[PDB]
Write a protein that binds this DNA or RNA. Structure first.
Ligand SMILES: [Mg+2]
Ligand SMILES: [Mg+2]
Ligand SMILES: [Mg+2]
Ligand SMILES: [Mg+2]
Ligand SMILES: [Mg+2]
Ligand SMILES: [Mg+2]
Ligand SMILES: [Mg+2]
Ligand SMILES: [Mg+2]
Ligand SMILES: [Mg+2]
Ligand SMILES: [Mg+2]
Ligand SMILES: [Mg+2]
Ligand SMILES: [Mg+2]
Ligand SMILES: [Mg+2]
Ligand SMILES: [Mg+2]
Ligand SMILES: [Mg+2]
Ligand SMILES: [Mg+2]
Ligand SMILES: [Mg+2]
Ligand SMILES: [Mg+2]
Ligand SMILES: [Mg+2]
Ligand SMILES: [Mg+2]
Ligand SMILES: [Mg+2]
Ligand SMILES: [Mg+2]
Ligand SMILES: [Mg+2]
Ligand SMILES: [Mg+2]
Ligand SMILES: [Mg+2]
Ligand SMILES: [Mg+2]
Ligand SMILES: [Mg+2]
Ligand SMILES: [Mg+2]
Ligand SMILES: [Mg+2]
Ligand SMILES: [Mg+2]
Ligand SMILES: [Mg+2]
Ligand SMILES: [Mg+2]
Ligand SMILES: [Mg+2]
Ligand SMILES: [Mg+2]
Ligand SMILES: [Mg+2]
Ligand SMILES: [Mg+2]
Ligand SMILES: [Mg+2]
Ligand SMILES: [Mg+2]
Ligand SMILES: [Mg+2]
Ligand SMILES: [Mg+2]
Ligand SMILES: [Mg+2]
Ligand SMILES: [Mg+2]
Ligand SMILES: [Mg+2]
Ligand SMILES: [Mg+2]
Ligand SMILES: [Mg+2]
Ligand SMILES: [Mg+2]
Ligand SMILES: [Mg+2]
Ligand SMILES: [Mg+2]
Ligand SMILES: [Mg+2]
Ligand SMILES: [Mg+2]
Ligand SMILES: [Mg+2]
Ligand SMILES: [Mg+2]
Ligand SMILES: [Mg+2]
Ligand SMILES: [Mg+2]
Ligand SMILES: [Mg+2]
Ligand SMILES: [Mg+2]
Ligand SMILES: [Mg+2]
Ligand SMILES: [Mg+2]
Ligand SMILES: [Mg+2]
Ligand SMILES: [Mg+2]
Ligand SMILES: [Mg+2]
Ligand SMILES: [Mg+2]
Ligand SMILES: [Mg+2]
Ligand SMILES: [Mg+2]
Ligand SMILES: [Mg+2]
Ligand SMILES: [Mg+2]
Ligand SMILES: [Mg+2]
Ligand SMILES: [Mg+2]
Ligand SMILES: [Mg+2]
Ligand SMILES: [Mg+2]
Ligand SMILES: [Mg+2]
Ligand SMILES: [Mg+2]
Ligand SMILES: [Mg+2]
Lengths: 134, 158, 265
RNA sequence: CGCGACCUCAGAUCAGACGUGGCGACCCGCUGAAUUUAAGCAUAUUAGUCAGCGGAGGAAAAGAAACUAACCAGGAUUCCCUCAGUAACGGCGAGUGAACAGGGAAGAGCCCAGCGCCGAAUCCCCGCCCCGCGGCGGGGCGCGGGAAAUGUGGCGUACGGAAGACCCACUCCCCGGCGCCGGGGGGCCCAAGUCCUUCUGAUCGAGGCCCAGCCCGUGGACGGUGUGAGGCCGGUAGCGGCCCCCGGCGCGCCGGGCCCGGGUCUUCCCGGAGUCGGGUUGCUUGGGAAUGCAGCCCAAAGCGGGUGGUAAACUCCAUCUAAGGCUAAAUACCGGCACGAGACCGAUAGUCAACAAGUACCGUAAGGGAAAGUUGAAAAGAACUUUGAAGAGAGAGUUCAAGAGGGCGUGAAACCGUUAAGAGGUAAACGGGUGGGGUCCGCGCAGUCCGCCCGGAGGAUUCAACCCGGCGGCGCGGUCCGGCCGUGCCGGCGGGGCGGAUCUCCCGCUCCCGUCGGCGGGGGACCGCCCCCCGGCCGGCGACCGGCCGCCGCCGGGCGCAUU
RNA sequence: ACGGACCAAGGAGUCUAACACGUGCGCGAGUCGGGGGCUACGAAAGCCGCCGUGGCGCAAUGAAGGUGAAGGCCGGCGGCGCGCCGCCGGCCGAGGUGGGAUCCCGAGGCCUUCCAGUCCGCCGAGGGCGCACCACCGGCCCGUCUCGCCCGCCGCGCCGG
RNA sequence: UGGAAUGCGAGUGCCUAGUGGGCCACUUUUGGUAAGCAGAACUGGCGCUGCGGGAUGAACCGAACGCCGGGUUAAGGCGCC
RNA sequence: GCCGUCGCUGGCAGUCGGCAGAGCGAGAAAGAGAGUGGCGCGGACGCUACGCCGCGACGAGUAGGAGGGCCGCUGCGGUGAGCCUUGAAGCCUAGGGCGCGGGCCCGGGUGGAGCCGCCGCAGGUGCAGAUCUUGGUGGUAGUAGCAAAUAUUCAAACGAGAACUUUGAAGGCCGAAGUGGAGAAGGGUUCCAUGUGAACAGCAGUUGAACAUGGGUCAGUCGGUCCUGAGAGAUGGGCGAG
RNA sequence: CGACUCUUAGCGGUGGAUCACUCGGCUCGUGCGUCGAUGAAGAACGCAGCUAGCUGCGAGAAUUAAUGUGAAUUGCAGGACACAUUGAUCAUCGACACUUCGAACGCACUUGCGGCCCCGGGUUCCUCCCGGGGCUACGCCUGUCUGAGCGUCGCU
């Protein structure tokens, strides 16, 4: 249950702040779970999806063990485009199909200075919590 | 039109009374606001009594109530004078002073004088500079026992 | 809004122009001109008797009657039939009322709370609350009331030392302080017989809170239990007693149906 | 004539400042109707209200008695409850209508003029030096300028105040700088299933996840995601974490100011004027031989003046001290910024405005002012062929579905096209009674089921009776033991809690001589009730039961092995 | 006579206050905390008791000053003359008549082989206590009118009863 | 010997809507030449009420009404409709 | 015969069973009384007591009152281990039924994501009307009409398409107070070129002042600009609650 | 026969009811409670590679700087020797900037006329011409300077 007096559980308000979220907030909303191997390696559960990440589709028509690279994070439409997750139009031109980030799994992470900093912070806060209970 | 037996009523609704209806839906909020201000005031003035300054005993006017005493506004200058408390000093140690009030009779005068002397006995007085105790300051032993008094100071009873 | 339907300057055309006499919107050049206004029959008009905020939303209930209700809810909570008829799965709780030692008042983890309900055989009530969780029919979904479920057991404690934080995440559970009992929680819907679990400390305060018959309440300034209008309710026993049976006339249990009249002639 | 002071008055794009306009929900000052009620209407009511004008602030206004009272007296203002629909006003009709006391919220008190004493002890501004400098200030130095004796500053103000004399007591209180130590805004993060089958276009669905009970849970709010999700993501929980900034609160150093009080006596001083008050007029009030306000006329006093709710004279009393000023809090808030929620409405509803809405459009203008939401999970938004000038079609294709094809969810009625059936010269329609024909339904078409008994054929986890074990009901067990227990009655040196408008050795303050009497503060005794301990009678265990014994019933296992 | 061409959706006794009676619940000569205070749902609920101030009720009556809700008997004494007034002390004591649900008593009686007489019940003429309620008659409190004789005292009165 | 017949259970109290334009017939009856006119008394009707008859008709005659079967009637009828 | 109402303020707790014994309808008060002496193991239903059962009478209704609705609509508290993508709401139906009725249930179809039963609570809760509101659609009806100002015809071109466009030729009209050539006010891009023929231009159009894509207004000397006109309007001053 | 008409049903139209949805309202509550001559509110006109409206902004014009964030924005294109301490985007917002009118201020309201000072280019000191910048409104307080008066005076 929620007790914070300054957090709204109103349905209309929550949806509005989802569909009008600014770009740097949509990034956090557009987060994906890490594969089991990655979760054990970094101690992190979720990361904000990013271009050049390699993911597995686990829900929908395109689910399967195939691993493809993230080629576009269309934050306006709240979908990502992946290699080979595509179909053909009437005229035969191929088009990417949008997958929501919460329906994929990150198998490999595009790592740079900032991504390593973000992973470290999440692993550190988790450790404080794990020891807080202990 | 009147119908059979009944009361003749004159409701006072011949103005634009709907323009000036005071609802009370903010009542619980008001009660929380006042309570939150009492607690924040008690913390600020601690260890001084939260209720406020000590009030004198007074007899309610008129023959409907003169059998009852209650809390007054402030101690008369005569009562402070008889008890040897300076009127300007009195407020600084939580005594309410009322320059307007008179003392017509000796009994009420002395009842409040005794009240003051008793209050002056229970008064724990801290030094102005904690490291430098002074003549009137209460002893260190009785300062560590000082606590904030809740409720009116020495409540008045009939 | 007190202004709804009145933010216009509509004027009645009067009679003679072959239209109803309802006030009509002024000017021209738009769909709104010449349309009905104000009246409660008009589209975009003012509703009949607009609702006011000074409706009397709140009811005073006498203190004595409120305490009566708390007394009747607790009395009805010690009867298995009434607790069963409230839908609670108490077919295996060892006893009614169900009193559990005061240790539970110091529980911290939600897993201790679940394990206690399973060993008291109060977990089937929770599993029945898990089954009733569903979406609410109607507009309540649009108004922050999407999910509905039934009530589980009520846990009544004397002092909270983590018991509230231990239990609050188990659906259907309600925590109640023994000295602050509520009829809205003890009799949800106005129907008595909510399954209640008592801590020993809470169970021992009941005499002081509400007083016995011989001893008035100690924690209520001036109160005592409501007197019985009928000391013995076992009507079958009363009617079969020799005293009453000796005064009865013999029963007349022969049916005299209508006789068909045959002509003697 | 000239020169020089002051006074009164001018001009400057003089140096430096300040006002204007807006918003206006709440607030203060004015001005101010008429619809309406009176079943007519003129006073009255509407109403000191709408409209109009001015002025503000985060609140405003008010506010420390020229008060209330008449008591054994209270003691600024504001607000709430009540007083109270009351005293009172009123074509005494309709109607209107307070205050005091009492209980609460909050609580805070003060400052001038005057009378006086201090060598104007006072203030502003320019220049230079130090400090600080996005709230322009502090210290120092100027035979720098001005203001001000037509009165600045200190003391002091009705609660009295001052000077002196005598006793008594006093070193922290503040201003400007500098340094060190313990609520608010922002940012980033922190539990657990996409496990195994399976439904689906897709699923968040269904089933499963050893004892035990998939896992987390201080987190099972909500939202998103191709249904319907605590565990997929954001979040949620947490006296959770990390990082910035602001504030508040303490402690030291430097340069400054102040040289500060109490009591008793002696002698002194003490107050607001074209204001009060009175007449009259007009308005206003519950205020009535006049509540408040205002104009005009008259016009004060100083043991005076004001009030003391019926005009006036005389006389006692009571209570304040007007005509100068400041002051937080409790109170108000349909505007503004930022939030939270709802037994509300759900696109003719709800704001006029769910959408490029105060928009389009109308009016010269003041103003008036709409209609209008929905493909799909995803544009996958229909390539290509063919007829046509094209609009449009026929194929094909996408999709779970276009029987969803861009004003596309569903898709009603009225109205219309066509198809099928029936019928038709008293307009049609209608009630009752039949008949004929269709549409379909019985998922009809040799027609029920049940118990007992007779007989023929078979087949057995085979019947009664006895034995063992478990459980259960009842027992006036004529009166078995043990228990809890009496909203029962009796005896207790019983160990206690609550209450009492029943009585009564200790202390604090206080009047009087070191004593004695009064208020308040506590034991104790007594009475009523209740709880708990102990003994006896009667008693229940049907809102409240165990062990034994007996009877009976049921079940499981034996044994019975067949005219059952 | 008036409205109605047709279809859809919308469309009219509501809410606040006051009063009256009826009904239901709580408590009961009391009752009520509504204002205030204390201690996610919850702005809820719980509590206050030297927070019951206050409202309504428990007393009416009169314009007001004001007053403000049963008596009888016994013994003794003072006065007037067995009867009346006043003062003392002891006893009893909230009215009566008619009707009146219900209750109580009971003349006699409710059978079985026939008598005596018991224990439990049961019906019943007649006779009683009489609820609520009604009618009637008395009483008592306040205003007012007539009549009239007394009683009290810190104020001897244009006093009070 | 509850003191004529007959029939019938009565008494009593609160709260209360609509109504407050009426109209028609036998008898009686005022004004008027009279009126399907205006105005009264009594009872009964229509209004509020269908149903059988009067061909038709607010009031006439019969008779008043739950949904039905059989029987018999009223006032009216029985050439044919 | 059946339905309902009213009445009997009617009857049933006695289902008292093998710890048994079957009754209390009968013209005429009160006991199926208690005592003291002279083989089988069996026996229907019932009773939501707000329930069930019996008997008798009755039944018109405006205005109006009352009762009962397992009549109906929306939301809240409880409950139904309720229903639902193996298909909710909604909608259609010469399908099967239930109820006096308000209505409801089931079958079939369409639809695509929610919904309902019961005990209570609450109400912006039920339409045939109001010359009701808003929206939609009819018949009238392929009807009234497309008749003010004399008038058209031939050939060709473009084009899918020509009474209406363009060119040529005829025949006509306005007839210098014009149907000519230019301005003021007003309009505001309508001007010009090219393209379209969806909508509009009350037939049509190959055309337009429509739509679309791009262009176009050049000043010492032509106007404004300056003057004053009737007049308007500050300051000083006066008045004024403002 | 068959038209026409009526009824019922299937299908198709016309229409947009119903149902389900809701980034909107409404109501209540809470905290804060802040405009302007340092130029407000309001209005006009502009500003995008392709942009009419809405939105945002002001000639630095769908934004600059700084800080936080950390790889996009997106309908199409493009990639500046744009993009990972050479920081995309978004957010924050303290720096800088902010056209014309408007209390609106040089005078007037036609983009009409000026005046003072300074700077630059024309030619070539001054003039003259063009351009840029800064001032030039009413009231009012303190002070300054310059004055006025057969106002009251003093010495000449
Ligand atoms: Mg009436
Ligand atoms: Mg509306
Ligand atoms: Mg619904
Ligand atoms: Mg200047
Ligand atoms: Mg009138
Ligand atoms: Mg009238
Ligand atoms: Mg009138
Ligand atoms: Mg008035
Ligand atoms: Mg106004
Ligand atoms: Mg104004
Ligand atoms: Mg202003
Ligand atoms: Mg302000
Ligand atoms: Mg006060
Ligand atoms: Mg009263
Ligand atoms: Mg009169
Ligand atoms: Mg008034
Ligand atoms: Mg008061
Ligand atoms: Mg207080
Ligand atoms: Mg002075
Ligand atoms: Mg004073
Ligand atoms: Mg998570
Ligand atoms: Mg979801
Ligand atoms: Mg599952
Ligand atoms: Mg979820
Ligand atoms: Mg799960
Ligand atoms: Mg989380
Ligand atoms: Mg947190
Ligand atoms: Mg004064
Ligand atoms: Mg005055
Ligand atoms: Mg006036
Ligand atoms: Mg008046
Ligand atoms: Mg007087
Ligand atoms: Mg003031
Ligand atoms: Mg709409
Ligand atoms: Mg609308
Ligand atoms: Mg619509
Ligand atoms: Mg709707
Ligand atoms: Mg609309
Ligand atoms: Mg729709
Ligand atoms: Mg959809
Ligand atoms: Mg479909
Ligand atoms: Mg569809
Ligand atoms: Mg649609
Ligand atoms: Mg559709
Ligand atoms: Mg046909
Ligand atoms: Mg009419
Ligand atoms: Mg008509
Ligand atoms: Mg409707
Ligand atoms: Mg009542
Ligand atoms: Mg809440
Ligand atoms: Mg007549
Ligand atoms: Mg009528
Ligand atoms: Mg009648
Ligand atoms: Mg009739
Ligand atoms: Mg005839
Ligand atoms: Mg018949
Ligand atoms: Mg009837
Ligand atoms: Mg049909
Ligand atoms: Mg959908
Ligand atoms: Mg509603
Ligand atoms: Mg309708
Ligand atoms: Mg024609
Ligand atoms: Mg023509
Ligand atoms: Mg021309
Ligand atoms: Mg021309
Ligand atoms: Mg045309
Ligand atoms: Mg042209
Ligand atoms: Mg003028
Ligand atoms: Mg058809
Ligand atoms: Mg543009
Ligand atoms: Mg930047
Ligand atoms: Mg950046
Ligand atoms: Mg001009």
């Amino acid at each position: 249950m929620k007790f914070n007096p300054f957090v709204t559980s109103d349905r209309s308000k929550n949806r509005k702040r989802h569909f009008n979220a600014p770009s740097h907030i949509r990034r956090k909303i557009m987060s994906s779970p890490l594969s089991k191997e990655l979760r054990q390696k970094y101690n992190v559960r979720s990361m904000p999806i990013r271009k050049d990440d390699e993911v597995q589709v686990v829900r929908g028509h395109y689910k399967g063990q195939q691993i493809g690279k993230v080629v576009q994070v269309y934050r306006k439409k709240y979908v990502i485009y992946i290699e080979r997750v595509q179909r053909e139009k009437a005229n035969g031109t191929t088009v990417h199909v949008g997958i929501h980030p919460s329906k994929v799994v990150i198998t490999r992470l595009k790592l740079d200075k900032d991504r390593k900093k973000i992973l470290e912070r999440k692993a550190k806060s988790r450790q404080v919590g794990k020891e807080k209970g202990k | 039109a009147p119908s059979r037996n009944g009361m003749i009523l004159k409701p006072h609704f011949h103005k634009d009374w709907q323009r000036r209806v005071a609802t009370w839906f903010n009542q619980p909020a008001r009660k929380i606001r006042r309570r939150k201000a009492r607690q924040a005031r008690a913390r600020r003035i601690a260890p001084r009594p939260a209720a406020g300054p000590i009030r004198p005993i007074v007899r309610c006017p008129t023959v409907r109530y003169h059998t009852k005493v209650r809390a007054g506004r402030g101690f008369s200058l005569e009562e402070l004078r008889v008890a040897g408390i300076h009127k300007k000093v009195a407020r600084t140690i939580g005594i309410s002073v009322d320059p307007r009030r008179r003392n017509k009779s000796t009994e009420s005068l002395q009842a409040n004088v005794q009240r003051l002397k008793e209050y002056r006995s229970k008064l724990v007085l801290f030094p102005r500079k904690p490291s430098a105790p002074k003549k009137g300051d209460s002893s260190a032993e009785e300062l560590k026992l000082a606590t904030q008094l809740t409720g009116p100071v020495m409540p008045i009873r009939n | 809004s007190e202004l709804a339907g009145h933010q216009t300057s509509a004027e009645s055309w009067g009679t003679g122009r072959a239209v109803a006499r309802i006030p009509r919107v002024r000017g021209g050049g738009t769909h709104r001109s010449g349309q009905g206004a104000f009246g409660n029959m008009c589209r975009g008009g003012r509703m009949f008797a607009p609702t006011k905020t000074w409706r009397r939303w709140h009811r005073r209930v006498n203190t004595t009657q409120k305490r009566y209700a708390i007394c009747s809810a607790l009395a009805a909570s010690a009867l298995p039939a009434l607790v069963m008829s409230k839908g609670h799965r108490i077919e295996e709780v060892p006893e009614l009322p169900l009193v559990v030692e005061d240790k539970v008042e110091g529980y911290k983890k939600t897993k201790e709370a679940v394990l206690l309900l399973k060993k008291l055989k109060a977990w089937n009530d929770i599993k029945k609350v898990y089954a009733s969780q569903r979406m609410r029919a109607g507009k309540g979904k649009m108004r922050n009331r999407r999910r509905i479920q039934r009530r589980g057991p009520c846990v009544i404690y004397n002092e909270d030392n983590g018991i509230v934080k231990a239990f609050r995440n188990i659906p259907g559970i309600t925590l109640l302080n023994v000295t602050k009992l509520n009829i809205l929680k003890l009799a949800p819907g106005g129907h008595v017989g909510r399954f209640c679990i008592w801590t020993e400390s809470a169970f021992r305060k009941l005499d002081d809170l509400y007083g016995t018959w011989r001893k008035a309440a100690s924690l209520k300034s001036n109160y005592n239990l409501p007197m019985h209008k009928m000391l013995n309710t076992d009507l079958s026993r009363i009617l079969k007693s020799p005293e009453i049976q000796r005064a009865l006339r013999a029963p007349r249990k022969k049916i005299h149906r209508r006789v068909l009249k045959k002509n003697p002639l």
